[PDB]
Structures are given as structure tokens and as C-alpha cells.
Nucleic acid binder design. Structure first.
Ligand code: MG
Ligand code: MG
Ligand code: MG
Ligand code: MG
Ligand code: MG
Ligand code: MG
Ligand code: MG
Ligand code: MG
Ligand code: MG
Ligand code: MG
Ligand code: ZN
Ligand code: ZN
Lengths: 402, 402
RNA sequence: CUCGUAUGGCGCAGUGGUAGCGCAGCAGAUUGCAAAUCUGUUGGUCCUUAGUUCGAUCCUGAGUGCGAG
RNA sequence: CUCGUAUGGCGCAGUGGUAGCGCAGCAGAUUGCAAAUCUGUUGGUCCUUAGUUCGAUCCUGAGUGCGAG
């Protein structure tokens, strides 16, 4: 049936570079899945693949959103889906590339459609959702469908809110909605994971930040600051739209010697991003696709043509030819990356909550752990210990008085 | 979503035995997938799991077909499908068990519906399908849609015929029909493969044949012979319905000291069956389900409870709990069975035909190899060699004639 | 003692010029027969020995094994 | 050869009773913000040393190291 190739991996691994090679070799068009590359201009910091390096290969769902808009999952689901259909009905093979692996969920119905589910929210309902209270909306969720509230921490406002929002608009318990999800892969998809040891990568990711400024990043930064300014925007705005990009918010303090710091801070955010990306691919993506993925070692660039190019072409060739892949699925070196221990084994299965009646956070609320394993990690934490001691001593001082 | 557990494996591995344990533990009902256990009575030779060993667990699509009927794929697809639906709408989890792994294809749309595709075959069309000629129906296929004819040998009458039959009833090239198949798994299925080293198994399969007669197999054999008789049936009938079962046709010659031979011949057929079953599971089933299967070592029965019972329960438990399986998927010992080299690597990919203009079979037709690899195997065969020599020597007597 | 046979794991051909078939075995196939079906392929040097002959697995002699007498 | 100053990976506080803050780091989460966000958490017992006091990072005196005319 209609095939679809997807390329995943961390930043600066050659995803775009590969995507092009395959596109040419197999007659296809690229579809960006990077949540930040969907915005207008600002190519240097948003690291868009230059045109004179696309061999004319068509690109979709990329650079079209106005800095005034707020892109998101569904916006991608509809857009990415159209590109697929369109590319397919033209005898071409789609190729989705990006670092926002979260969006990839659309490729296998891992979402909840609440748009076609019209329902005028009630004054009572809304007043709860948009409540100014800290942990009140959570209690509401625990009340209606506690089997979903237990899968979230009482502080995960963004998510706890979403869940309740669903319960309202759909009038159906979100927990149930999930148990009923089919979660089946859409289209005969081929997941290619381009990977590279963290050390070598981190180095490249750093240098690619240096000559990233040399190419005139500061110009795009000031530009972004001009728009940021003349708009009365506060730093807390850097949690929406383009304002989330890694390459702007980091230099905000340099916009009130020290610019050098904003650069380091940026190099760090990038580093962390790459790390969180692997974690997702290993604990979220792979487990979701039952492990039907193929690794490509791009650690030693001096090679690439062999480890990435050829291998990717080899697998893709058998793939498109509508045949069972004979390739090893993973080179000896990265073999353990697809192991159960490195993947589904790490996923949290115990959701029972625990509230330490002795420890409390800066927000005043008492610490609440999820899962017996971590509940204990906390009990043995110096935090809990140091606090359990001061508590005992205070309680003891009185014992002595008597 | 609606889960479905399936248990595959060779004969005498404990599939039924396991199916029951799971059924109880997880509240489910068994669905037989054995093409021979679907017939009436004849339990000893058809090895039906005894009732007083089913703990009252419901069984479906098993023992209901009259010896006068001819069960087949679709017949199973509809029947198996109903049981699933029915079991599901009752809060129960279906458990399909059997050795006819071929039928399992229904679990992931690996067939072609040609019943709802009514079309009065033409006198010209029919005269070709039911042609008395040896290799004429094949030529017709090569004419219309040669891309499918090349995937079959010109002697595979049963299949070449079906392909052409499809081309007619559907008026759509069968080759195309396949390239368009989605081949997606139906229901959240869990494939459990109960395996056992061939040697220990072969031993059990043999003794299993001895006390199989002691339980009164000959009584069922004579019974089958009574019906076989008084019906003017010839041995060539043993290619249809129950007549295919392993436990009857083998004793036909003993029905015109020598019975001992018919028993050996049976132990062999069973042995071969077990071998062909593994080959299917490794080269057909697994490759088709992308390798989403879990092995259970039942080689050392003294264990079972640990390697089979517990493990199966552990995996099934996480499965039914709608959670990503944390189990290893394969015990160190049988690890290599799920390797690419032992599976998709063996599947034939080269379909180019080759006709040895020198070698010919008993039917007169010239040998035709499929796949360069095997084309060569033939060229170096003693058959081809011995024949190429007599041919040269005879031609060398022509030069001497000048 | 009569007359017979002695070929790859087993059951069988064959020819005065250095051997095939079936079965098992191994392997590929499998989209209404699948416990069925199709297809490809590895094994011996024709029991030992002395001769006849240009040359013997096949012809004669003997030995040995086995077969019904 | 007289003054300063050294506390977890880095950067800096600090009470006489056996230690913090910021970063990193490590871990769990993710079904309309995901380059985001939520959550949990490992590292040192305070340069070494003589003592001063019931007691020591925090007091007194040496020595090590760096910086300072
Ligand atoms: Mg890119
Ligand atoms: Mg703009
Ligand atoms: Mg390169
Ligand atoms: Mg048992
Ligand atoms: Mg059974
Ligand atoms: Mg009957
Ligand atoms: Mg076999
Ligand atoms: Mg013999
Ligand atoms: Mg002579
Ligand atoms: Mg001291
Ligand atoms: Zn605590
Ligand atoms: Zn030949």
C-alpha cells in the first residue's frame, strides 16, 4: 500500500542531508516535522536546510506560520496529512523529517479530536478550567474519571487541564477514550533513526552553534528582538510560538562580555534538547511502534556514505519495493539501543500516588511521588532525611522538657 | 482497544494446554485454528484437546464441519471473525490456537475477497480455468498480468489457477490487488510462539503417536475407512477435506506386519509437518507481523511452568493491561530464532525465471528455475551435469561424422 | 545340497565403455484445498576377490551376506 | 621576606553543634504549548595540620597552594 518514510534523530545528525538523498534516489518530497521550522524566515537559528542544498526537492509544512500564530499538534496533523495525500496521489513518496518526534504520533492515531466535538462550555465548567487557583482544577479531574488523574502529577497544569478539557468537550472519560484507541500505524511507514554517540555529537552541536552566529545569527536575534519589542512582550512569553526557539530567549538578558554567557547557555539548551530527544525515541516512539525501526550510525561522519547513505538506501529500496526488510535493523555498535532494557523497560507502570506529610516544596504543597520505586527514592533522599531529622529533634526537645 | 491473543507453534508443544491456563487467568475463550480439528468427531487422530481438560473454557470454530464439507480460508475468516466479535462484546478476550498458521493471515487482511465480487464466468474464461491441458492456464496468466505469473512456477496449478480466477472475478490484476493491500494487523493482537528444539520434540511427537493408537486410533481409522468406503473413494481423494488428515491416508495401503509400516509413515508425516510449521512461522508469519512476537521455550517440559506458564502469563498480563511489554521477547537460548538471518533473510526476492533447455522432468517439460541463486544451484547440480555430459558426448559423435 | 539376489540411509532400476528413480533428508514457494500442494537439491561409484576383454556395475570362477527351497 | 585567599563538576554564600544557593548533572512524565512544560533526585561532611573549648567548616597558631608591594 501507500508507503511513507520517516527520519528521526537528534539535532545535527544529518537528517535533512539524508532526507534529500533518499528523496532523489526514490522520487519523493520532504515534509518538515520540526515545530520551530514551521515559522516564517529566521532560518539561521531555526536551522532550516538551505535551498541551494535541496536539489529542488519539494518541501512541505515548513516555513509558513506567522510569528503571530501558535502552531501545535492538530495544526500539524491536518497539514502533514494533506502533504501525504497530495504527494501520494502524484506517484511520489513522502518523507517526514524533524526533531519534534512528539508530532510523529499523528502517524498512528495517538491523539484526541476535540474540534469536531462542539460543545459550549458551561460557566461552571469554564470557571474551573480557567481557575486562578493552583491545584483546584486537578481535584475536579480526580472527581470525574480518577483513572486519568492518577497518570498525572497535580502540578502538571498544562496537561491536567487538557485532560479535563477533553472530559468536557467530549463528555467521555479521557481514560476510557485512551483504552479504546487503536493506536495503529497509518500508511506502510518506515522509521529510520539516525543516531550518533553523545560525545562526538555534543562537539558538533557546539561548533554548529559557533559558526551559526558567524553566519549572522545575531542579526536574526535582534530582528526577533525588534518584534519581541514594540509589542510589550515579557520573558514569560517565551513559552509560546516561536518564542520557544533555542536561539532567542537565551540572549534576552544580553538585551537587558556577557553575550558570551548567552552563547554558552544556548549551547547547553541544545545539548539538553538532543538528550531529551533520544529519551523520547527510546521511551516513547519505539515502544509505540513496537520496535519496528532501523538504526543508522552517523557517529563517524568520515564515513556516513557507508553507514548512513548506503544502508538507508538499501533498507528504503527493499521497503518501497514492498518487501520484508533484510537489513539487520541495527549495527552491532548501536545494537543495545533497541533492547527492551533501553526502551519499554524504562516506562513507568506504577502510578499509585504518595504524599510525604513531612516534606513540602517552595510552593507550599506537600511532595507527592508517583510509583513505589520513586516513592522510596524520595524517602531515602537527603531532602527527606534532613527534614525528617529537624522534625524529630523539634519533637524531641519537648520530650526532654517533660 | 479490543485485544486478541494468539498461540502458535508446532504440534505437541502444549499450545492447547497453555491456551487453557491463559483463558482462566485472563477470562477468555479459545478459538481453534487447526484446519483438521474443525471436523466432526475423529478426536484421537485429529488430536482435539479433551473436554475434561478444558476447565469449562468455551471453544469455537472447532468440531462442526461435516466430513462431506470442505473447510477453507474464508470459511475460517468469517467463522473466526464472528467468534472474536462475540467473545469481545461479552467482556472476554479471544484466544486463537492452532497449527494451521496459514489461516492466521486473516488476522491482518492477507487475502482477497472474491465472493462479494459476483461475475458470471464466460464460457471462454471457464474453458481456460478448467482446462484439461497441463500448462495452458499458466500461459493465459502470463498474458494478462505477467507480474503475478512470475511469482509462481508454471506447475503450481492450484495457485496459478486461483490467481487467474481472481483476475476474472475481480477484473483487476491480482498483482496490483496485492500492492494495494494494507496488510495491517486486525485488533491489538499478541503473538505467542511456543517453541521446542526439534530433537526433544521429535521424540515426543513419536511417542505421542504410539499411545495415540493405544487410546484407540485404529477405531477412528476404520471408522474413517468405512465412510471412505461405501462411497467409492480413491486415494487421490486424500487431497480434500478430512481426507488430508495425518492419521488416515497413511494407513490406506494397510487396508489394501505391514501396519507397523503405516505407523512409521505416519510418524514421519507428523515430523515433517512440525518442520514445515517452523519454516512458516519463521519465513511467513514473523516477517508479515514485522517481528512483533514473543518466544516461549517449551523444550524442557520438566520446567514449562517457569519458561512457559509464568512467562506467558507475565507477557499476557502486561498486554491485556494495555501496556508496552517489558518481557525480553525471547529467551537467550532461542534468541537467534528471531534474527533477521533466520527470518526475512530467507525469503525469496529474485523471481526472474530460467529455462534449462537441456534438462527436463518426467512430465516432459523443461526444468525452470526461479531466482538467479537457485538457477545456479541447478546448473551445478549433478542432474544438469550428468545430462550436459551425455548431451556433449552425443554431439561429439556428430563432429566425428565429418 | 537346489535355484536366486547382493547398487547412495531404506526400497528399487539400468547398460560391455566408469550409474539413475522413489522415499527419507536438505532447501525455496504458499493471498479459497494448507495435517494439503508445487518446486529445486546433497548423498553411491554399483558387496570382496581372481579372471575374459581394448575396456566392465553389468560376462565366468570363487568367497561372503541375504532369499525361498 | 609582610598581607590576602581558598566550601560538592563549575560559580558563590554561610550558624558553634557534625552544611547551603545558582548552575550544570542524573532520573520519571508527555494524547492542542513539546526547541516547550511538569516532576523527582545523586555528588562535598568545608585546603592540610597543632591545639582552643563538651563540640566543631565557622575561634587561635603553624604548614600546603594560589594571588598581592
Ligand atoms: Mg534538518
Ligand atoms: Mg513576521
Ligand atoms: Mg555529510
Ligand atoms: Mg504441560
Ligand atoms: Mg492442540
Ligand atoms: Mg461424519
Ligand atoms: Mg522439511
Ligand atoms: Mg536396498
Ligand atoms: Mg588382456
Ligand atoms: Mg580539630
Ligand atoms: Zn519527605
Ligand atoms: Zn539443466
Amino acid at each position: 500500500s501507500k508507503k511513507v518514510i520517516v527520519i528521526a534523530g537528534t539535532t545535527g545528525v544529518g537528517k535533512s542531508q539524508l532526507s534529500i538523498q533518499l528523496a532523489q534516489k526514490f522520487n519523493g518530497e520532504v515534509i518538515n516535522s520540526d515545530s520551530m521550522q514551521v515559522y516564517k524566515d529566521i532560518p539561521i537559528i531555526t536551522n532550516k536546510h538551505p535551498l541551494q542544498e535541496r536539489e529542488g526537492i519539494p518541501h512541505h509544512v515548513m516555513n509558513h506560520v506567522d510569528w503571530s500564530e501558535e502552531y501545535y499538534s492538530h495544526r500539524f496533523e491536518t497539514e502533514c496529512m494533506n502533504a501525504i495525500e497530495d504527494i501520494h496521489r502524484r506517484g511520489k513518496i513522502p518523507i517526514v523529517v524533524g526533531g519534534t518526534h512528539y508530532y510523529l504520533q499523528t502517524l498512528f492515531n495517538k491523539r484526541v479530536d476535540t474540534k469536531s466535538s462542539e460543545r459550549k462550555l458551561t460557566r461552571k465548567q469554564l470557571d474551573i478550567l480557567e481557575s486562578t487557583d493552583p491545584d483546584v482544577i486537578y481535584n475536579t479531574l480526580v472527581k470525574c474519571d480518577p483513572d486519568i488523574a492518577t497518570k498525572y502529577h497535580p502540578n502538571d497544569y498544562r496537561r491536567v487541564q487538557r485532560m479535563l478539557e477533553i472530559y468536557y468537550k467530549t463528555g467521555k472519560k479521557p481514560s476510557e477514550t485512551f483504552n479504546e484507541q487503536k493506536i495503529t500505524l497509518k500508511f506502510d511507514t518506515l522509521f529510520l533513526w539516525l543516531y550518533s554517540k553523545p560525545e562526538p555529537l555534543f562537539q558538533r552541536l557546539d561548533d554548529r552553534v559557533d559558526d551559526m552566529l558567524e553566519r549572522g545569527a545575531l542579526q536574526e536575534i535582534k530582528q526577533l528582538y525588534e518584534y519581541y519589542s514594540q509589542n510589550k512582550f515579557t520573558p514569560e512569553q517565551c513559552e509560546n510560538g516561536v518564542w520557544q526557539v533555542i536561539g532567542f530567549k537565551e540572549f534576552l538578558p544580553w538585551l537587558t562580555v556577557k553575550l558570551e554567557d548567552c552563547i554558552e547557555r544556548m549551547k547547553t539548551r541544545t545539548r539538553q534538547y538532543a538528550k531529551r530527544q533520544v529519551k523520547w525515541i527510546k521511551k516513547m516512539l519505539i515502544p509505540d511502534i513496537k520496535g519496528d525501526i532501523y538504526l543508522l550510525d552517523a557517529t563517524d561522519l568520515s564515513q556516513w556514505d557507508t553507514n548512513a547513505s548506503q544502508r538507508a538506501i538499501a533498507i528504503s529500496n527493499d521497503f518501497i519495493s514492498n518487501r520484508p526488510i533484510k537489513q539487520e535493523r541495527a549495527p552491532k555498535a548501536l545494537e543495545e539501543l533497541l533492547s527492551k532494557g533501553e526502551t519499554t523497560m524504562k516506562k513507568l507502570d506504577d502510578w499509585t500516588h504518595y504524599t510525604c506529610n513531612v516534606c513540602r516544596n517552595a510552593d507550599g504543597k506537600n511532595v507527592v511521588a508517583i510509583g513505589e520505586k520513586y516513592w522510596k527514592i524520595h524517602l531515602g533522599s537527603r531532602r527527606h532525611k534532613s527534614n525528617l531529622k529537624r522534625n524529630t529533634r523539634q519533637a524531641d526537645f519537648e520530650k526532654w522538657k517533660i
